[PDB]
Design a protein around this ligand. Structure first.
Ligand code: FE
Ligand code: FE
Ligand code: FE
Length: 179
């Protein structure tokens, strides 16, 4: 039938952006670079600011540390595809617009305890999808195509995103435990 669910507070869930799947590993690298750099330079810095403005500077520092590692993921792929020209898709542009909306309301976002909770839950959502679904599938196709260096790179990114997921889960557990 019709099956309606409330959208998340402040639309914070729409910060998650999903790399697009293609037949060709060059194109999956391009899509991954695009999302990795978006997370490095837009999504995670915004989450870090939400955390700091919420009075949670340790969680802010974790998002800053994750942001740097997303940029490492992008730079590993860029090294392997030195000539690729990466442009932001409509969906990335729309995410960056949403980022700027949140930044303009950052005090209201942070003063409600949902701001940081939903930022950590969206970070967990992307780290989960990337580590368990997207990047394993990119690794598998690269290997099928005989591109061992790129398959090995995606395998390393899988392990790194898995670590991020674990950092985010521990942070969420600590945010939610008062004492
Ligand atoms: Fe990522
Ligand atoms: Fe990444
Ligand atoms: Fe990550």
């Amino acid at each position: 039938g019709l099956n309606y669910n409330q959208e998340d507070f402040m639309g914070l869930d729409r910060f998650f952006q999903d790399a697009v799947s293609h037949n060709n590993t060059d194109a999956n690298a391009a899509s991954s670079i695009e999302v990795e750099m978006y997370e490095c330079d837009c999504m995670y810095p915004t989450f870090a600011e939400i955390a700091r403005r919420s009075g949670q500077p340790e969680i802010g520092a974790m998002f800053d540390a994750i942001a740097k590692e997303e940029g490492m993921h992008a730079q590993l792929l860029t090294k392997l595809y030195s000539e690729l020209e990466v442009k932001d898709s409509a969906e990335t542009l729309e995410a960056k617009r949403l980022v700027s909306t949140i930044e303009s309301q950052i005090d209201a976002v942070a003063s409600d305890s949902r701001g940081l909770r939903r930022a950590l839950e969206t970070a967990l959502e992307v780290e989960t999808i990337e580590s368990q679904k997207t990047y394993p599938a990119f690794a598998k196709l690269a290997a099928e195509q005989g591109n061992m260096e790129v398959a090995t790179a995606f395998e390393a990114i899988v392990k790194s995103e898995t670590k991020h997921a674990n950092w985010v889960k521990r942070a969420l557990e600590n945010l939610l435990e008062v004492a």
